[PDB]
Amino acid sequence: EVLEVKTGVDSITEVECFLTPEMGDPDEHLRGFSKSISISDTFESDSPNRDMLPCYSVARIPLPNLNNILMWEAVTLKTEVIGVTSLMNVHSNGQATHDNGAGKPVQGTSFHFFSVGGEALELQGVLFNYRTKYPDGTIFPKNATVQSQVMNTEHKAYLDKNKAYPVECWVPDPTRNENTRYFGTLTGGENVPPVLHITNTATTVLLDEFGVGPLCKGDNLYLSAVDVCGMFTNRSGFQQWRGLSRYFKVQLRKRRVK
Amino acid sequence: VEVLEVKTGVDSITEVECFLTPEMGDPDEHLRGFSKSISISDTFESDSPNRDMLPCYSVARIPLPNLILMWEAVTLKTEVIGVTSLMNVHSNGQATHDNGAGKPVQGTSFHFFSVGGEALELQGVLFNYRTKYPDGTIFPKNATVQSQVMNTEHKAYLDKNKAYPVECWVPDPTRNENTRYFGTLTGGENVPPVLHITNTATTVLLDEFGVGPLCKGDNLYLSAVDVCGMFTNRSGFQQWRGLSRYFKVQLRKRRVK
Amino acid sequence: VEVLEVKTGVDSITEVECFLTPEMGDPDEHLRGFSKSISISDTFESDSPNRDMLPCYSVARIPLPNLILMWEAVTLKTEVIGVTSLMNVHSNGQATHDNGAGKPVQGTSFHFFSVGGEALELQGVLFNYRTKYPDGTIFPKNATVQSQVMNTEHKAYLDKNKAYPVECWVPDPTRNENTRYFGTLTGGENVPPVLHITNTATTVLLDEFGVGPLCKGDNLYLSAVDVCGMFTNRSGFQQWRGLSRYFKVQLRKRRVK
Amino acid sequence: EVLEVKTGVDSITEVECFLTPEMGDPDEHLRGFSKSISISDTFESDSPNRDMLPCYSVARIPLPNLILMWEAVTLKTEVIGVTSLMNVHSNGQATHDNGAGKPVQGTSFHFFSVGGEALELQGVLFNYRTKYPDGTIFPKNATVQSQVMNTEHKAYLDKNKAYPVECWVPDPTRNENTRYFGTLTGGENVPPVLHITNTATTVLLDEFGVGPLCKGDNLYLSAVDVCGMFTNRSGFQQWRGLSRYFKVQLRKRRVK
Amino acid sequence: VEVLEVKTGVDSITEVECFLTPEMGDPDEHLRGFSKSISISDTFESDSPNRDMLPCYSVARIPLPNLNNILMWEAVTLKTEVIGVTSLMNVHSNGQATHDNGAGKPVQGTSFHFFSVGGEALELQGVLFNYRTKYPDGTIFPKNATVQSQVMNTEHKAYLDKNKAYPVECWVPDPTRNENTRYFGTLTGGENVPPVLHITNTATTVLLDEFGVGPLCKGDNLYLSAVDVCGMFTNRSGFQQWRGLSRYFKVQLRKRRVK
């Protein structure tokens, strides 16, 4: 039960940070990239390596202790993808688009996703191929059945660990997440162009239809993201996912609850 | 029905929340959510699709708490479930070029949902009136060449799962007064899927008189199609790929005469 | 006419609901909704399309209850009927690559509709003024080279079905005071059809003075074109494919002097 | 000094007309097309022929003789003949074996303006060493700076079939007494997207509630509607343009 | 800075109007507005771009009427426009024919369109596609790069305080700073991406923040920044060059008292 907002100078606070992408980081020079993608011979034999799998990013940000029951209420978000212009590097071991041409820029399938919540993002598992063998060191839908290719309600989890939950197996659970606001776009196809807007003049309001934002349990704010921008194609044609960091600025206020 | 006032009080509202699985054809025990690979007849006359190559409309009839009062559907939140699964470009796909990743799901899509107080009303329209639709499907009967544009004989209710093929039926715009429907067809073999997800978006189901669908016999009807595109295998064979759809509907008690 | 007050009361409103079938050329008894395969002239000057290769504007004139009072058209709901039929990619199509599904309908599209209290007024514009338009169609006569850009002699009324070729005529923006019209041409050979359906969208037909089309002689005129794109067969021959359009119009009685 | 609007029966008027495109008109049969486009052998030798260069269209429309001035308040406009681009049977290049002709497509520029005096132009050159042909009005004394901004290149759109589209844009440092709108969509496979309706009005009033004030009782209308390129059987490409409809409502306004 | 009332009166508003020229690299005396042709390194380690192959941010510091009570000029509105959009219709100047007998391939592919108005220099954060890229002499670039610089390294902070210097590909606006600037940009990537460029003199952007305050011009200087890489020009032989265009700015300012 939600009561009144506290006012006064001490009543507001602000969280500011960035979440780095977790694309797989196949070697010490390739932070922000995945391993080159290879294709299994069959559905049965799909067995991606961990460094080939982009994962959800998450940060748990402690807020000023509030231990009347008060909670921090997240009200507004400003967010931005950081380093969008890095994708103009078309002179770095890329594949020429045509004889004597510049390198093929990063493109193809993208997923841009962010959420703000008063607890961990709740996830539902959905598998493209239920017979995929997910690698050690990732957290993936377990006891998969063919029904996992459409909906298996056993696959419930919390986004509670960084570089662990592969993007391709998990989505926000729309049956839960009442105390989180999430937003995402998947743009598919191998040739889709990245379209990335930046400005410091856009704010998202996080209040629901009753004027209540995410309420931070135990004084923690949960920020989550995925920004798979597309694939980089190298000179020999191997393709790697490329990700970028996401900025978050969230304003919170103190709210009394019963 | 003459529509009178809304009931208030804590008992006066209820909520339905569920998901509808897609019915893309399910050609074997490992391929739920996919169709059979798509083949092409040599002529219009010989068009004879397998049942498991034809995606169908999904429908769920949701019983509501027993109630002259009727449940009125006011708001919908909906969402395609599992959008990220289409990032699996490593599973038996066709490389886009030498050493490349697999071609992702792409091509013709149909995304559709409806909320109604009775079954969705369908009108039959055939691409090719001589198509032979297979046993187990419910399809436009006594088809003529006029069925390729409009034959008013082809009326039906979406009253059964895995039955009504997507390609030969649409919502009947001459009926459906007690239903709200929304759909988009995006055609072309290279169309990129564009799938948005959020829990912050609500659709209001009220018509221009402030009246939502009224649930006859205390049943709410949900229907959906989410054909996302085609998956292309190593050999170039293509299968429709679908995803489940979440519905959350809020309803209120309304008195009627 | 001075336009005076709207009449109220039970008798004072009416509704029209119908569908217009597309007129794409209909080359044989099995191919309603399709044009003949398109062939290309050997030279610019020898362009001579056959009648069954030329999509035409559709038009219906709808009698209203007999009534100075005039029926005033206030709102429109409209929808393309049978959007899902374009998922038939298994019927005499051209494979998009080896073992692939059929190339779906795509390419140049024109979706157009109008509602008026008299016939839609047309202005003729020709791609090529030396085109020989075929007998049985109504086309810009006495064409000159100016007809490729603007020849004000080419005026007509859309007063006949299966007659006015889409490629020759557009709504005349210098006239049509008593009609509301809306169209989109999307050109290019691979453009993807994007077709939205819903029963929740209404267009208001009133002008800036709050006045809708006034139906002369108690007739309402509906017009449409819905060339969705081209179908490509196995051998690569291409034909226009069209679909029917639904109209629901609400009208009220208006007094006039 | 703008004062009040005059009301009453006599105080409004309306202009209605069509501007034809000026695409180059390479022969007596080819009104609305350019000459087939050829490509120079090098950058320094770029020398387009006149009939290969689309130009800005302009009409100066006399208004009822009137201190009062006609003030332009609203505009309805659209491209005339959009359906003509469905002719894919007229000696085009087949998209594939047995296919229909390739439709008009590729780079487009759609532009219109309404002003109480001639549109003011600023010159910018893709390649300052382009020799523009006799019979066109082009930026003079071009330098390498003309490729980005050379403020010497100022002109008025005061003549039809004369100012090449590729050389000139509206001058954003001027045109206080004009409203202009344009979109360039570039790329050889760009599909035309053309909307028509008689239900859309553009308001021409500025933030102070004042529209273009017509000097000398003349209204200036300008347009470009390069819809794309038509590809002939043999691969040669010509710009194709279409006419634009204008309807402008004007009201009498007192001025000091 | 405690922001107080706006001054009114005839002498209390002013206007700045100008154009920023693009800085694409200018590889020779005939190629203002173009980059050098793009070449591709065989490894990430060996990426060493020449200066004239690297587009850079444009910046102008515009002196305002002197105000030295403390008054500061406050930027309130912006009109802006890319100048010369129609130049991209030159498909006849030694381009690569799209097909036999066809016109020249128009400028297309990756674009970045960006503008900012601030009361002090735009603040930048460095991000690198490839941390081992060696940026050339005469450019100002992220120093002491590490592999973390490919995603976020907070050491890479700078001010856009010099023209023809800050390469577009390694710097973005720093979202943790820029309180006294309003910035807007769009990256559209992909080699076949069609330029879509709108021009009009009827559009205005309001520069006021959620509290009604616009950029306050420190030292009576207005900072304008821009990038307008429109795509690439492909010549006959297939070599590709970036092509940019100038940007118009008209900014209205008012006098604002501060404590």
Ligand SMILES: CC(=O)N[C@@H]1[C@@H](O)[C@H](O[C@@H]2O[C@H](CO[C@]3(C(=O)O)C[C@H](O)[C@@H](NC(C)=O)[C@H]([C@H](O)[C@H](O)CO)O3)[C@H](O)[C@H](O)[C@H]2O)[C@@H](CO)O[C@H]1O
């Ligand atoms: C009947 C036919 O299309 N024949 C082809 C020849 O045209 C072609 O030889 C080229 O012809 C050129 C001039 O002819 C055209 C053209 O550019 O192709 C013919 C077009 O139909 C015509 N288009 C229109 C709308 O009128 C076009 C136009 O008038 C001008 O381009 C205006 O600039 O002219 C020219 O002489 C070339 O040098 C010549 O190669 C041959 C070989 O490609 O194939 C024939 O089948």
